[PDB]
Amino acid sequence: MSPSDFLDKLMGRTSGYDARIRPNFKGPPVNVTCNIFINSFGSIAETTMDYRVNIFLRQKWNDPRLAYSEYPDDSLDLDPSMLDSIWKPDLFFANEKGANFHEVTTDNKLLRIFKNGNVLYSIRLTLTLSCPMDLKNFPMDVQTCIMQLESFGYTMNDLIFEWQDEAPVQVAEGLTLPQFLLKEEKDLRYCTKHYNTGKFTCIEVRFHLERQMGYYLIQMYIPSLLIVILSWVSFWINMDAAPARVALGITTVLTMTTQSSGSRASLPKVSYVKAIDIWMAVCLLFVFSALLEYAAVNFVSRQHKVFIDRAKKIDTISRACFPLAFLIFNIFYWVIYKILRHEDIH
Amino acid sequence: MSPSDFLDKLMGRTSGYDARIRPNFKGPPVNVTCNIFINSFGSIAETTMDYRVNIFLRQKWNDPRLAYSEYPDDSLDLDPSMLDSIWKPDLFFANEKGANFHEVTTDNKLLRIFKNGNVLYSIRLTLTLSCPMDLKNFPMDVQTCIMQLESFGYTMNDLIFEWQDEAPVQVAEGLTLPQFLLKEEKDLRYCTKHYNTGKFTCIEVRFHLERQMGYYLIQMYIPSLLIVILSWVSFWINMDAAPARVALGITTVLTMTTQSSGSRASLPKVSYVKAIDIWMAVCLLFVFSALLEYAAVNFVSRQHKVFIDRAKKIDTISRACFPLAFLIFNIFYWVIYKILRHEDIH
Amino acid sequence: MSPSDFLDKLMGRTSGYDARIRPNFKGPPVNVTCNIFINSFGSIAETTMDYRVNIFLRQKWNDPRLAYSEYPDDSLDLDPSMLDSIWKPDLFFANEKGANFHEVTTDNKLLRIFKNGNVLYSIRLTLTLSCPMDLKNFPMDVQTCIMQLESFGYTMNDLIFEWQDEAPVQVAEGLTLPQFLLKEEKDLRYCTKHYNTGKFTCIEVRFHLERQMGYYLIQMYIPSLLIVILSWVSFWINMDAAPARVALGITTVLTMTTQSSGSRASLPKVSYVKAIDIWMAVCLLFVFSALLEYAAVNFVSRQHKVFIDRAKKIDTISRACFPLAFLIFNIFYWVIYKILRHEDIH
Amino acid sequence: MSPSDFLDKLMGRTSGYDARIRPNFKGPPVNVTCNIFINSFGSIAETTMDYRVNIFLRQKWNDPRLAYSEYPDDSLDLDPSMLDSIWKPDLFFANEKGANFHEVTTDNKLLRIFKNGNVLYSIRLTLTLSCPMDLKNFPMDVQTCIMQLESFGYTMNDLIFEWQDEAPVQVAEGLTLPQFLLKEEKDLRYCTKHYNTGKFTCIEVRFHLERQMGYYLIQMYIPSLLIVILSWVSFWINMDAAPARVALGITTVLTMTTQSSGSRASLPKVSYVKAIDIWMAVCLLFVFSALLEYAAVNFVSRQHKVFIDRAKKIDTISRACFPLAFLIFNIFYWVIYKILRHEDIH
Amino acid sequence: MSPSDFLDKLMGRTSGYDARIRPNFKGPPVNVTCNIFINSFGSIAETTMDYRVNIFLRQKWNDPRLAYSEYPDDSLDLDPSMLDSIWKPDLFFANEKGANFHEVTTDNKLLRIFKNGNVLYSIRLTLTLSCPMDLKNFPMDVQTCIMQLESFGYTMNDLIFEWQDEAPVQVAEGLTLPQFLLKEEKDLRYCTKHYNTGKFTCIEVRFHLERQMGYYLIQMYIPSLLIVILSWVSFWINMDAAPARVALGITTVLTMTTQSSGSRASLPKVSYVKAIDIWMAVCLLFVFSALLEYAAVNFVSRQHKVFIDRAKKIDTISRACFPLAFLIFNIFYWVIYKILRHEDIH
Ligand SMILES: *[C@@H]1O[C@H](CO)[C@@H](O[C@@H]2O[C@H](CO)[C@@H](O)[C@H](O)[C@H]2NC(C)=O)[C@H](O)[C@H]1NC(C)=O
Ligand SMILES: *[C@@H]1O[C@H](CO)[C@@H](O[C@@H]2O[C@H](CO)[C@@H](O)[C@H](O)[C@H]2NC(C)=O)[C@H](O)[C@H]1NC(C)=O
Ligand SMILES: *[C@@H]1O[C@H](CO)[C@@H](O[C@@H]2O[C@H](CO)[C@@H](O)[C@H](O)[C@H]2NC(C)=O)[C@H](O)[C@H]1NC(C)=O
Ligand SMILES: *[C@@H]1O[C@H](CO)[C@@H](O[C@@H]2O[C@H](CO)[C@@H](O)[C@H](O)[C@H]2NC(C)=O)[C@H](O)[C@H]1NC(C)=O
Ligand SMILES: *[C@@H]1O[C@H](CO)[C@@H](O[C@@H]2O[C@H](CO)[C@@H](O)[C@H](O)[C@H]2NC(C)=O)[C@H](O)[C@H]1NC(C)=O
Ligand SMILES: [Zn+2]
Ligand SMILES: [Zn+2]
Ligand SMILES: [Zn+2]
Ligand SMILES: [Zn+2]
Ligand SMILES: [Zn+2]
Ligand SMILES: [Zn+2]
Ligand SMILES: [Zn+2]
Ligand SMILES: [Zn+2]
Ligand SMILES: [Zn+2]
Ligand SMILES: [Zn+2]
């Protein structure tokens, strides 16, 4: 025939096609097979508990009214503007905060109609999805980001969503994240929303992201350790140098206070302790105990010669005991925090 | 019949339906039963005095012109695009700063028409609602967020809003807030706007949110207490160490000044004192009195031996009196601030 | 008759009504009576010199072509969607930076047509209006925010704007501002724009806002005073304690420098001095003169015993003279700044 | 006749008017006379190198097909909605980053048709125009902001842009800028874009803006000078006070480092030196040389009495030489920077 | 003929033209020749790993159905509004985060139809393109920004994209960047996307940008060097001045810590070391070793005269060895970092 006539013949007034009626109106529910292709991944903000994604959302379903045989071609890669003249599933993202299409030059849309009536519907989307994050074990945590594909108007008696058996989630090659590693395996679950308006279909993916500790070591693990070592210099400073040892205790304690507040600058105001909070608390306790060590030496040395060697013994004991107890803490902290991270994500 | 014909028969030119006319035009006012489902809750900013919500707004009313009997089906879950061909209430949010719909894939809308003429109208909305906050008792406060549903064009003689008798407000399971606890009980009030243009219907919910103090203890309650203890080390420092005790008083006072200004960084510029302001003022008064204590010891010790034991007596008295008076203040501050919080929200 | 027929009969093709023609086309100019209702007030930013408002804009004018008598009803509260089929004034805000309507559920619009032809047109608007601010006397200033309602296309020969005789401006009950007090009285002026395109009508309101000083006292008035008192401790510190008195002068001067820069953090980069700048300059001069006082005592004490009592006399004189001169400055500063604020706003 | 009939008679199907055809299709090019009225000016950000303006753009051209004689009126101030039914020039701004119209109540548009066929077309626009800035001589610089009005689709053979002979640029009375002075004179140039698609018309204005130095004197010129004077106190401090003079050198050098980094906080990361960078570098060199002066006095004083008066001579020489050399630098810096600013803008 | 009739004759119902059908429907694929003109370049943010561009995108292809001979004119520069009535390629940008058109006064679009059927289609676009950046060698790095032009709906059997043989990329004259130099040469590659939906055409440019080091030298290369020199003053400070040398070591170490954290303020949280991180680590190691040098001198000097000249020998050796080893590090650091930058970009 001609390319234009076939398009407006299969659907329209002459054929009787109605886009407001689901394909099998009073029969079995429509089964929509979905699969996504992640084009980009980033903007993971813990303060707002969300992340931004850019995906190619593909949907496959069978429409018996769109089946054709006369036209010679097998598939039919048609124009996007007609997408309003056909029935489409009312998919929506349950945990979506913001979303939009793309019209950079034309509509970033695709539609194919096969001979048997199968419809492939691909679309480009930018999504801002909410992600509740557990920040206990914060510099060393594995977050799980979810993506729920839910129907809004049709129940399970009308619309059912299914993930493709092969490759429901595909990630673009070379897609890296500056802060996390995206695990190769993905979890495909079966959500089902139960409202007072009825039952609604839902499908869900889970992405596992491990936080990289290279930034946090050079940002607040090594500089705080350096402050603890800098506090240990006072044990070798001469005893009568009171403005020297006291200023050494003070600058280290106040710096540890500012570094402790600086470790939560980019984090939400949660109300539970974290692993970095435990490390900051122990380092602050160590520098404060070093200052209390000199406050005791300064008090013991003036009680009037037993008191000259008794105060010097505290300095000699603190020279070896302060790094040994800090090493024992470092062993227990790092070992138990590399033990909890081997726990299964599931 | 056929699915398409019934939809355009009940309403349209042939039936005579007009979407610009309320159902009972010159009779009793239309009663709209409303109930909301909170999908997300967050973005509670004290600086802008607002919070962001994402709800499913359901509206129920009876339209006698939409009653049908011939079609076999009980309910009629129809397509959203037709929503312009029917009459809908002109609901609007009185305390709304910004609002928008959702069109992530299709319209996030739902409409059902029953046999008797009842219309269920569900919609997805993102709202930025203004919330006036009282920050007296700030680290330990219970805020009340409101949501007013008001008609804009119709008076009480035409439109009346009512909350559903069962479950007007439903919260999604597992919805947590990083900063607040959402109380299970909700207050359903009856606002009524009186303008010079007439009387207008209004309904209102109240959400009670208790601020969690876990963040604020580790952020500005314990570090300021540590500065007060660090200031108490000077009482044990040797008397003639003037650059040591003076630098101890100075660094503690200047740090208390910076922490006091740091406690109001994320707060609006209100003009009344708060509980954290009282705590910061007392801690600043304590470290400043410790420095004045050494300024008196340094002045008394040089008046030329009575003056050697008289100045030492002030040090010995301040060693026990400074923590005892600080403990008495801590008891009165915490007790009275755990007494005011047991006061009923209502 | 029927409700629908009357609406499309009064205006349309059959009646001959044209929305592109002003009511009295070649007669007296159309007089539009305007009055606003402020729903919210806030977002007053000095850096961008603007403020955000949310108002109900009401407009009243007479259209002889819309007069009816046959229909029984007195007023006619009709549907908003028809608002395009009638003539409306081309009002616009002269000092508007950004503006938008509201479509949270439906159009936030209202239109009534009376028997004689009077048209009441209410609309909801969010406005970001520019406000030039004079920040001399900044912590204690009264700003005047303006709102100009101007016609864009019609001259005085066609369109005239007037304020309602009773209640042109109404403020919602309980509307408070965290930073300012909104004065109860308002000024209704008569602007008139003179361009090269002709003469254009304009009406203007003026809002008077007094800045509350409760925040600024605890933020940068009392902490700077505390630094000045902390600088006065050096006069009581022992004379030979050079690292003590010198470090006392240095930390106070550098802190006064940081507080002076901190007082202009949220302010625009204006090029005239302010009241807080005068207070910061005098406090910085006081702490710098205290350090120069010890620099003179340290120089006088070593000139080799007259020089021992001569240097001690400067300390004794500075003990009483430094707070007395600071008290005299505080009296003159506060008195003259409570005198300028009693000056009439007009 | 009637007002409505004339509007649709001059243009439309009956007359044969086509909005897709330029007035003189195959004759001389259309000459469009342009003039702008600046309503607001601000948001000048050096980091993004742009500024925001709000203008009334007026365009005048002759359309022979719009000439009328029968209708009685001289000019014809018509309704804005019809603006799509006539031909308009395809003006666009070459250096525009973002732009939008205004629809606060209606379209902020104006169109007049005269008897001879002249068309006056006024529109309200908000523009974010890019401005390349030269920041050498930064606290004391005169920037030149440009505005290019270019045609996008028509060449010089079809469309020519011209500035009005009288008042091409008019500024609203009382329009001030918090950071700059807008020079009264303006430069009207003749740009002409040469692409591979052909030749295109362009016209350009230039605004000269002088930066006000009142903010920068009190922000980083006087506080850095105060640090230099504070560093000169060490020359009067006693020689053996090593922790006093050393702490005086250290706090001044570290403060000069922080003030130097603070001077470029709101500036883009350019790679050439500026006048404030030269001032910061010389002030940092002065305080660092004062510390090296005490490092030399402390080294010379202990070489074992010639060495007691030799080290004291360096202190006495540095007491007068350090302010004299700083005064000579201040004279040469300010004189040459008030000489370069008298250079013609052109 | 007449200008209007020809436009609607070549395409439309009478001619049979369909915009939903590609020109050669069942023949060879359509070859689209593309070339871009960069109007502006900037907003290069490393934190979000993106950059903003403003380009003129030109597309050339042959449409046999648009060939004409009767009309006299060679080319046909027509009106933009008709652009919907013709077939256009479905180009889209693969690495695009956000994009929009421009409608400042009219559509910023251009279309020309030649006699043989060639179509030139120019459009103005603002793009926010993602750019993965390697920040190893960060203050001295050459980034490569890419721009992929990909088809969304048509495969290689239908649509093929090609770069123009002459001048695919043209940069506007005088276009400078405050932070980078845009290399004159550009790389034109051949991407080809392989999805599960089929094969898709793609073309790609590469821009090479060299970071300018003028800002980073005065921002964090020279101030850190000054801290290292300031730490070398302690070697000349007198030995028994313990509060002087200790405070000199402390302020320098804490300042180096704050400058090290300040060097990564505007950078993303990557987990690999950079060149500035290596420089900051070595400078921190140098000032910390200077403090350990005085901690050893202070310990050796009190062991009770051999111990008086033995501790003085460490001071004399450290006076020359500390700058010599720092000079050797500076030679190896700068030489190897000027060697890696001569490596070919390709
Ligand atoms: C959609 O999928 C469901 C589930 O596989 C199909 O329902 C089954 O259909 C088969 C074929 O008639 C029956 O034998 C089963 O008993 C059905 N199971 C259930 C639970 O209903 C359904 O037919 C599919 N829809 C379409 C249009 O093919
Ligand atoms: C909407 O609700 C109101 C209040 O219940 C109804 O008004 C009452 O209607 C009953 C039934 O006719 C009367 O007996 C009462 O006297 C009415 N009370 C008032 C205060 O008006 C109203 O009828 C309802 N509207 C509809 C359409 O059912
Ligand atoms: C709009 O208001 C103006 C001013 O009150 C009216 O103009 C006056 O109209 C009266 C009644 O005819 C005359 O007596 C006056 O001489 C007019 N004054 C001026 C300055 O024109 C005008 O008529 C009003 N418009 C309408 C439609 O009522
Ligand atoms: C637009 O302006 C140009 C330049 O003034 C006009 O071109 C001139 O027209 C006059 C009158 O016919 C001629 O004598 C000149 O030789 C023309 N000069 C050039 C360079 O073309 C043009 O006619 C104007 N267009 C209209 C419609 O008036
Ligand atoms: C688009 O370009 C391709 C590649 O040059 C063209 O394909 C070639 O066409 C010539 C001419 O018929 C043949 O001789 C070659 O064998 C073709 N090569 C391939 C790989 O197909 C194609 O014809 C061009 N399309 C149009 C419409 O001109
Ligand atoms: Zn896009
Ligand atoms: Zn898993
Ligand atoms: Zn959405
Ligand atoms: Zn309650
Ligand atoms: Zn709204
Ligand atoms: Zn007034
Ligand atoms: Zn506007
Ligand atoms: Zn000029
Ligand atoms: Zn634009
Ligand atoms: Zn290359």
PDB file of C-alpha atoms in Angstrom, chain D residues 170-262:
ATOM      1  CA  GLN D 170      16.705  55.056  28.389  1.00  0.00           C
ATOM      2  CA  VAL D 171      17.267  54.188  32.064  1.00  0.00           C
ATOM      3  CA  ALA D 172      14.459  54.430  34.607  1.00  0.00           C
ATOM      4  CA  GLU D 173      14.779  57.367  36.983  1.00  0.00           C
ATOM      5  CA  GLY D 174      16.251  56.511  40.364  1.00  0.00           C
ATOM      6  CA  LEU D 175      17.727  53.188  39.211  1.00  0.00           C
ATOM      7  CA  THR D 176      20.784  52.645  41.411  1.00  0.00           C
ATOM      8  CA  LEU D 177      23.178  49.735  41.827  1.00  0.00           C
ATOM      9  CA  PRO D 178      24.591  48.688  45.230  1.00  0.00           C
ATOM     10  CA  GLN D 179      28.013  47.853  43.750  1.00  0.00           C
ATOM     11  CA  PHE D 180      28.483  49.975  40.607  1.00  0.00           C
ATOM     12  CA  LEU D 181      27.748  53.342  39.035  1.00  0.00           C
ATOM     13  CA  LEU D 182      26.091  53.214  35.620  1.00  0.00           C
ATOM     14  CA  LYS D 183      27.751  55.800  33.390  1.00  0.00           C
ATOM     15  CA  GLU D 184      25.376  58.216  31.682  1.00  0.00           C
ATOM     16  CA  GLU D 185      26.990  57.818  28.262  1.00  0.00           C
ATOM     17  CA  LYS D 186      26.483  54.668  26.197  1.00  0.00           C
ATOM     18  CA  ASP D 187      28.280  53.277  23.147  1.00  0.00           C
ATOM     19  CA  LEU D 188      26.200  52.191  20.142  1.00  0.00           C
ATOM     20  CA  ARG D 189      28.276  49.945  17.887  1.00  0.00           C
ATOM     21  CA  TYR D 190      27.669  47.906  14.722  1.00  0.00           C
ATOM     22  CA  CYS D 191      28.322  44.192  15.065  1.00  0.00           C
ATOM     23  CA  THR D 192      27.915  41.925  12.042  1.00  0.00           C
ATOM     24  CA  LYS D 193      28.046  38.151  12.449  1.00  0.00           C
ATOM     25  CA  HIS D 194      29.801  36.181   9.694  1.00  0.00           C
ATOM     26  CA  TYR D 195      28.907  32.488   9.850  1.00  0.00           C
ATOM     27  CA  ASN D 196      29.102  29.754   7.236  1.00  0.00           C
ATOM     28  CA  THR D 197      25.326  30.191   6.814  1.00  0.00           C
ATOM     29  CA  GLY D 198      25.673  33.807   5.645  1.00  0.00           C
ATOM     30  CA  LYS D 199      25.775  37.370   6.940  1.00  0.00           C
ATOM     31  CA  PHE D 200      23.502  38.506   9.774  1.00  0.00           C
ATOM     32  CA  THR D 201      22.660  41.920  11.195  1.00  0.00           C
ATOM     33  CA  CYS D 202      23.590  42.947  14.727  1.00  0.00           C
ATOM     34  CA  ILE D 203      23.521  46.046  16.922  1.00  0.00           C
ATOM     35  CA  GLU D 204      25.240  46.476  20.259  1.00  0.00           C
ATOM     36  CA  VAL D 205      25.215  48.712  23.324  1.00  0.00           C
ATOM     37  CA  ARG D 206      27.987  49.035  25.907  1.00  0.00           C
ATOM     38  CA  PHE D 207      27.372  49.892  29.568  1.00  0.00           C
ATOM     39  CA  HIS D 208      30.282  51.180  31.656  1.00  0.00           C
ATOM     40  CA  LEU D 209      30.176  50.265  35.355  1.00  0.00           C
ATOM     41  CA  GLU D 210      32.665  51.615  37.895  1.00  0.00           C
ATOM     42  CA  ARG D 211      33.139  49.478  41.003  1.00  0.00           C
ATOM     43  CA  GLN D 212      32.637  51.367  44.267  1.00  0.00           C
ATOM     44  CA  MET D 213      35.566  51.001  46.666  1.00  0.00           C
ATOM     45  CA  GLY D 214      33.717  51.844  49.888  1.00  0.00           C
ATOM     46  CA  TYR D 215      32.964  48.214  50.668  1.00  0.00           C
ATOM     47  CA  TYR D 216      36.431  46.942  49.800  1.00  0.00           C
ATOM     48  CA  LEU D 217      38.195  49.513  51.974  1.00  0.00           C
ATOM     49  CA  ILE D 218      36.381  48.445  55.146  1.00  0.00           C
ATOM     50  CA  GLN D 219      36.393  44.791  54.129  1.00  0.00           C
ATOM     51  CA  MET D 220      40.001  44.043  53.142  1.00  0.00           C
ATOM     52  CA  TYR D 221      42.011  47.299  52.854  1.00  0.00           C
ATOM     53  CA  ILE D 222      41.761  48.704  56.407  1.00  0.00           C
ATOM     54  CA  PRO D 223      41.740  45.321  58.273  1.00  0.00           C
ATOM     55  CA  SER D 224      44.931  44.243  56.474  1.00  0.00           C
ATOM     56  CA  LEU D 225      46.492  47.603  57.245  1.00  0.00           C
ATOM     57  CA  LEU D 226      45.552  47.055  60.863  1.00  0.00           C
ATOM     58  CA  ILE D 227      47.367  43.710  60.803  1.00  0.00           C
ATOM     59  CA  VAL D 228      50.482  45.467  59.467  1.00  0.00           C
ATOM     60  CA  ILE D 229      50.309  48.050  62.248  1.00  0.00           C
ATOM     61  CA  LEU D 230      49.698  45.263  64.761  1.00  0.00           C
ATOM     62  CA  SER D 231      52.884  43.616  63.483  1.00  0.00           C
ATOM     63  CA  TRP D 232      54.780  46.853  64.120  1.00  0.00           C
ATOM     64  CA  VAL D 233      54.022  46.602  67.881  1.00  0.00           C
ATOM     65  CA  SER D 234      56.651  43.861  68.127  1.00  0.00           C
ATOM     66  CA  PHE D 235      59.381  46.408  67.479  1.00  0.00           C
ATOM     67  CA  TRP D 236      58.384  48.063  70.770  1.00  0.00           C
ATOM     68  CA  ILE D 237      57.984  44.776  72.659  1.00  0.00           C
ATOM     69  CA  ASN D 238      60.910  43.876  74.930  1.00  0.00           C
ATOM     70  CA  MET D 239      63.685  41.884  73.284  1.00  0.00           C
ATOM     71  CA  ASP D 240      63.859  38.858  75.591  1.00  0.00           C
ATOM     72  CA  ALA D 241      60.082  38.275  75.367  1.00  0.00           C
ATOM     73  CA  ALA D 242      60.524  35.457  72.848  1.00  0.00           C
ATOM     74  CA  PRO D 243      57.048  33.824  73.192  1.00  0.00           C
ATOM     75  CA  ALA D 244      55.518  37.301  72.924  1.00  0.00           C
ATOM     76  CA  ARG D 245      57.321  38.505  69.825  1.00  0.00           C
ATOM     77  CA  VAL D 246      57.184  35.086  68.145  1.00  0.00           C
ATOM     78  CA  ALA D 247      53.432  34.721  68.796  1.00  0.00           C
ATOM     79  CA  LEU D 248      53.017  38.284  67.494  1.00  0.00           C
ATOM     80  CA  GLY D 249      54.777  37.338  64.260  1.00  0.00           C
ATOM     81  CA  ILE D 250      52.862  34.080  63.896  1.00  0.00           C
ATOM     82  CA  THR D 251      49.320  35.276  64.464  1.00  0.00           C
ATOM     83  CA  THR D 252      49.870  38.180  62.070  1.00  0.00           C
ATOM     84  CA  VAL D 253      51.322  35.993  59.314  1.00  0.00           C
ATOM     85  CA  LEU D 254      48.592  33.358  59.585  1.00  0.00           C
ATOM     86  CA  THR D 255      45.904  36.044  59.675  1.00  0.00           C
ATOM     87  CA  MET D 256      47.381  37.665  56.570  1.00  0.00           C
ATOM     88  CA  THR D 257      47.236  34.266  54.864  1.00  0.00           C
ATOM     89  CA  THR D 258      43.560  33.828  55.718  1.00  0.00           C
ATOM     90  CA  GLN D 259      42.717  37.386  54.635  1.00  0.00           C
ATOM     91  CA  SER D 260      44.570  36.828  51.361  1.00  0.00           C
ATOM     92  CA  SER D 261      42.516  33.730  50.659  1.00  0.00           C
ATOM     93  CA  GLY D 262      39.386  35.596  51.790  1.00  0.00           C
TER      94      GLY D 262
END
